[PDB]
Design a protein around this ligand. Structure first.
Ligand SMILES: Nc1ncnc2c1ncn2[C@H]1C[C@H](O)[C@@H](COP(=O)(O)OP(=O)(O)OP(=O)(O)O)O1
Ligand SMILES: Nc1ncnc2c1ncn2[C@H]1C[C@H](O)[C@@H](COP(=O)(O)OP(=O)(O)OP(=O)(O)O)O1
Ligand SMILES: Nc1ncnc2c1ncn2[C@H]1C[C@H](O)[C@@H](COP(=O)(O)OP(=O)(O)OP(=O)(O)O)O1
Ligand SMILES: Nc1ncnc2c1ncn2[C@H]1C[C@H](O)[C@@H](COP(=O)(O)OP(=O)(O)OP(=O)(O)O)O1
Ligand SMILES: [Mg+2]
Ligand SMILES: [Mg+2]
Ligand SMILES: [Mg+2]
Ligand SMILES: [Mg+2]
Lengths: 733, 734
């Protein structure tokens, strides 16, 4: 006898079969799901005059709550119901409108960029509509749909109104990025790229997902700024930071050049008051566009281990201490090279300098290890040069102690970053990284915010979904699509600072990584910790880099190599396979399966469109769209639970039903040796770096605390295998 | 005696107490109520075999210095002269200084003096300048003065502590530099007259001039006013500008009132403002960017209007309570208030809070047009579409005065008084802020870049007349001529690290000349602060100051031309301070004008002024000690001030305590603030800019030992009633 209120506002007799009908539709092809159980939980909440929209949200939440290890398919049941809801919210019906009608309407509403209607005719939109398969929305998991509704789908932020659906997002991201291609190949590229992303072969970053098709041109999420040892450069760096954090980009700040506390200025007219007050200025710049401390501005600051103030800099993050000697809301990357590690192993000392007192020492630190050791020993014996001496063990232990307690003191092996690099260290050294330490690019300090001679490094990101490919040879096609799409974005996006545009147009650097690596290993019956994945990893990332290079090489044939290609090691006929850490030969004997020598000559002849191509970034948000495991990291559990605005979101690792025993969870691992080996093997082929984590469970250790010896052991293990950077240290509770 | 002493060259000889007695006799000459034997008594006991002569001398200096008291103030000169003697030997190897030319030549070679001294003056001119010098004027310093000379002013090597010059060389060369470009028919005449003025303490010069002018430096700017626009580009520019100037030890005044409120839409709603406070924090780290520790270092005052939407959060930025996220403790703040705000308080009504980004024309009118402000304010109060918040005026004022009382560093600027009674036309060049110490009031324009040529940063060159050293007010004619011309020449002399600042300085050529020894000046004439007995004398005195300053700048304009932006002044349209003062001053002062202002009015109409502003009453804590003057216009807290320092305890007696101890009115001997505030208001009648006015309270003089809010608000309104533009420190006795 009860009545429901329909979406139009009309009223009608309640019909439980209609709910049953929708649930049946969503349950097609699913295993171990019960329609009746969902109905049971939903029915009790029904009242006279209840809205149909409210009825639907009731069964969505009911289905979402039933997501478990025993019945993972509820993630697709709940997802499809959610998609159904979003269709109605955006279109007033399930079936989406014609693409051209949709685009026209959205342009009039100011939600889409008008250039879509200028670059494509109505007939071309009709044709693009035939590419679209809206039923691919039925392949999302529940967590994916929530990220779509929350972050990606074009919507009204005031009212929450959803304006588009997932396949429209995909096809128009494709249409925009390839809008400047000639008409003989354009729609072919659009279809092929649309297929790649909508079938989760290629994973796109958040700013591209939410932005590309809209009037915005802000797509840079990653920025590298080098600060010079001067007030002009400090101000310039600060201004650049403010500009880019206002666009919600993460910042990597090199401040290692800033001379130490007590250093003479202009011969002695004044004396330096220390690096720390300037760090604070950088911090407030990073947090200038943030309310509260929940998220907002994020930055990593880099400095050499041998800096005179290093003992003060290492402790900047811990809770204890006064405000005067703490800069807690930034992360830090300590820059280390071979000599430092040598001093550690030999139990000798480390001498601390101010870069302003050691001519050429700072440059050699990154570019020339032989010259560094010469100058370093030269200056250690010079008594006229201001210095301080510390026990190497004491210094490393302090670093690792703060890294353990905060988890946010990072390591960068700067020699590995330049001996095994796409760049000639004598011309364009890598002297820092980004926020998450996967980016390694050249920089030049600015003497003004609009300095035309400074260089700010940017990088456009994306990732291959290793769990979505059947054969490694699929990467040829996917690399062509990924590289061409991102290279087009470089000309598409805007640059708020000249020094940033100069780097992007000069080197055209890209950073393409992977997701679902853990699922990839379980599929092939391998694991992280036992070394059984070494050869598979070697084979996999050879193919990735080869096809990326091959794609960028062919793109250079067609449109020309990047203007600053001559500054690469690639330009001199050098490949990653020539300069990798030779210690990798002891842990992987997998042969090369591709003709690198043919590629070498083709690169020498035609060059590369992009100075860099590969970088292994972390991906939490991006990964959820594919229901992929996060980047190269092992999952902490079969089911992840995340509290949020719209309730608790559950997410099951891909194909738990068949691979529950095959997965190796994070805390099921003995130590870090296996994982670090895999990272080193990856780094053999990766152009830039990898966001590698270290993990420790105190329970696995006597007295329940990780001994320093184990920390230093893993640190040296990473360096041994040519690992460039170390990101988070996760400690289990 | 078996005892031996060690001489300066390293030789040793048998101790002779007569030599100590001889030096003591020399230093004690003309001094009364000092005992040589007592100094000898305290000193001799500390002597050991082989003691250095220098250490012997430092012993008798300290002995004499410790005997500085009310019963025997002349020990301040005994100790000082002994110190001078010591500094002579340290610099010259003997008591008598070398010839001026020989001295300059040596110092230029050592790189301690600027070379342009030898390029601008011939040897004969240096010989002639040496005849001006009276090194015996070193004998007139007090002990506190000499320590300040040794500590801050005398050209020295900071590494070794070596002293290279003496006071009269400092004075004569400051004169020589500032007047170096003057024509040869008048140049050396100007040099002598200025030297006489400063060495006999008529004119008091600021620290950066005292220590700087004659050395290779060109950094002399000590106060900077920066206005921040409501944009990232301007915020960046402001930040960069701050960093540059605090690196040159300058105090900063920051106007950040334009920055829109938390939650305000950006670009129509593409983003939303995250609040003023995070930007304030960035300004703070900029101010502190060149500072180690929290002791002194970078200093700044930040300004905002009382009706700003975030005002309730801004007012509490200094107090100890709260997390670090909502506190910006290491800057001071000036709350900007006008008549309408006070009206709402008196009528017990409400005050509406706005974001300047949502109220077109309101911010501009707040400073320039009070009638238009009231029209727009009430217009926007009735508009419901416009975002706003409402608070009871009493509650808002009480919150402000609450934080002002507890911290002492929440300041008030009456912006309507700052523009209706001003040397500037508010429609063209409004005064929209002040400086660190709330005495400077100059026009500013925001920057869109650190090197923006269309922005304007306000600068001001300071100095002060010593009211205690002049015999009659007509001496100010000569002194104003010297002061104005010396400072005006400095404008062309000093460097400008930022274009927007160079524009303001060269455009308006603004000066800030004040007074010191005002309390002693009152005591000399048998007047006091609190009973109203000084009202007419103050009127007489500060009419004379402003008239002679204007007269000097007017004549300087005849000779060298008016400042490029003179047409933006009220002076240019024939308006004088005597036309626009707060009319409530007539009820507390009936002193007539003694000078021909109408003749001056016409002469300014014809020839103009070289400087847009001339007068400002700054605090003088360091500057005053050279003259042994009472600080600025402030009453002394005691007859003898005890100040602990690195070099020991410095005792300083108020001038002529011997005869005027009953004539002085010490700070805590005062009933309230009314008398003082009336004097400030009367001063402000003639002062071009503003005055660093303090409010003082003694909890002991109040029931339950707590200063009631009613008194705080009463004094606030009293200040506004008599046209007071700004309120600096609030001092609370402990
Ligand atoms: N009469 C009904 N009684 C009970 N549940 C109903 C009824 N009609 C629809 N529902 C349920 C089915 C779904 O779980 C949910 C949403 O269905 P939906 O078709 O979008 O609503 P609607 O029929 O009011 O609008 P539309 O006009 O778009 O069909 O409401
Ligand atoms: N007044 C100051 N107080 C503290 N630190 C300062 C000051 N001025 C500059 N610094 C810092 C900023 C830089 O880290 C470093 C050098 O500054 P910089 O602007 O290059 O001065 P400079 O170019 O005039 O002299 P130098 O030859 O020593 O570099 O000292
Ligand atoms: N032989 C002495 N016995 C006792 N006191 C002495 C003796 N010589 C100097 N003094 C006192 C007098 C002064 O206050 C102080 C030294 O003053 P001073 O004349 O500058 O030193 P000096 O005589 O050793 O070197 P100089 O050759 O520069 O004069 O100590
Ligand atoms: N992303 C941001 N987050 C927080 N505050 C911001 C952000 N961007 C700018 N602001 C501040 C700075 C200014 O006070 C104000 C906007 O000024 P501005 O930087 O000039 O932006 P705009 O010119 O592009 O837009 P508008 O037309 O709204 O001023 O808000
Ligand atoms: Mg229906
Ligand atoms: Mg420099
Ligand atoms: Mg002697
Ligand atoms: Mg703007």
């Amino acid at each position: 006898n009860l009545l429901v209120t329909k979406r139009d506002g009309s009223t009608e007799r309640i019909n439980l079969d209609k709910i049953h009908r929708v649930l049946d539709w969503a349950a097609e092809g699913l295993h171990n799901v019960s329609i009746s159980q969902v109905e049971l939980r939903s029915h009790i909440q029904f009242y006279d005059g209840i809205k149909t929209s409210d009825i639907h949200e009731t069964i969505i939440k009911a289905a979402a709550d039933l997501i478990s290890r025993d019945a993972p398919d509820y993630q697709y049941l709940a997802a499809r119901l959610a998609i159904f809801h979003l269709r109605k919210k955006a279109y007033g019906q399930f079936e989406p409108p014609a693409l051209y009608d949709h685009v026209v309407k959205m342009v009039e509403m100011g939600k889409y960029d008008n250039h879509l209607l200028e670059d494509y005719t109505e007939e071309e939109f009709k044709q693009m509509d035939t590419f679209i398969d809206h039923d691919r929305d039925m392949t999302f998991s529940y967590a994916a749909v929530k990220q779509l509704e929350g972050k990606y789908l074009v919507q009204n932020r005031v009212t929450g109104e959803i304006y588009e659906s997932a396949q429209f997002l995909y096809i128009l991201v494709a249409a925009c990025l390839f809008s400047n291609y000639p008409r003989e190949t354009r729609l072919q590229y659009v279809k092929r790229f649309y297929d790649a992303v909508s079938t989760f072969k290629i994973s796109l970053p958040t700013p591209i997902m939410s932005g590309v098709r809209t009037p915005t041109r802000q797509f840079s999420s990653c920025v590298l700024i080098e600060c010079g040892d001067s007030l002009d450069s400090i101000n310039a760096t600060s201004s650049a930071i403010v500009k880019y954090v206002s666009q919600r980009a993460g910042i990597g700040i090199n401040a290692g050049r800033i001379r130490a506390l007590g250093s003479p200025i202009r011969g002695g007219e004044a004396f330096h008051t220390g690096c720390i007050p300037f760090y604070k200025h950088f911090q407030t710049a990073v947090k200038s566009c943030s309310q509260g401390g929940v998220r907002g501005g994020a930055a990593t600051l880099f400095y050499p281990m041998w800096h005179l103030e290093v003992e003060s800099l290492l402790v900047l993050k811990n809770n204890r201490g006064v405000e005067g000697n703490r800069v807690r809301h930034m992360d830090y990357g300590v820059q280390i090279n071979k000599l430092m590690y040598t001093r550690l192993l030999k139990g000798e000392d480390i001498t601390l300098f101010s870069p302003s007192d050691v001519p050429g020492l700072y440059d050699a630190f990154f570019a020339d290890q032989e010259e560094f050791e010469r100058l370093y020993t030269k200056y250690e014996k010079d008594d006229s040069i201001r210095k301080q001496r510390v026990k190497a063990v004491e210094l490393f232990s302090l670093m690792m102690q703060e890294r353990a307690s905060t988890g946010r003191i990072y390591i960068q092996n700067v020699d590995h970053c330049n001996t095994h690099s796409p760049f000639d260290p004598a011309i364009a050294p890598v002297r820092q990284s980004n926020l998450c330490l996967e980016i390694a690019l050249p920089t030049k300090p600015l003497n003004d915010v609009n300095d035309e001679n400074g260089e700010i490094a940017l990088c456009t990101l994306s990732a291959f979904n290793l769990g979505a490919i059947n054969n490694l040879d699929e990467l040829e096609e996917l690399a062509i699509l990924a590289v061409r799409a991102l290279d087009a974005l470089l000309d598409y996006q805007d640059y708020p600072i000249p020094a940033a545009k100069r780097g992007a147009m000069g080197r055209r650097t890209l950073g393409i990584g992977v997701i679902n690596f853990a699922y990839y290993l379980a599929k092939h019956g391998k694991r992280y910790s036992d070394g059984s994945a070494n050869n598979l990893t070697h084979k996999t990332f050879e193919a990735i880099q080869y096809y990326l290079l091959k794609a960028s090489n062919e793109l250079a044939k067609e449109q020309g190599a990047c203007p600053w290609f001559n500054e690469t090691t690639y330009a001199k006929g050098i490949l990653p396979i020539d300069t990798y850490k030779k210690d990798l030969d002891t842990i992987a004997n997998e042969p090369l399966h591709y003709d690198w020598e043919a590629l070498r000559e083709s690169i020498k002849t035609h060059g590369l469109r992009n100075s860099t191509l590969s970088a292994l970034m972390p991906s939490e948000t991006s990964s959820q769209i594919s229901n992929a495991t996060n980047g190269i990291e092992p999952p902490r559990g079969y089911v992840s639970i995340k509290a949020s605005k719209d309730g608790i979101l559950r997410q099951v690792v891909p194909d738990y039903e068949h691979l529950h025993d095959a997965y190796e969870l994070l805390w099921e691992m003995p130590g870090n040796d296996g994982y670090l080996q895999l990272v080193g093997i990856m780094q053999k082929f990766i152009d830039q770096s990898i966001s590698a984590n270290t993990n420790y469970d105190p329970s696995r250790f006597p007295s329940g605390k990780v001994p320093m010896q184990q920390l230093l052991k893993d640190l040296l293990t990473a360096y041994k295998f040519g690992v460039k950077t170390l990101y988070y240290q996760n400690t289990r509770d």
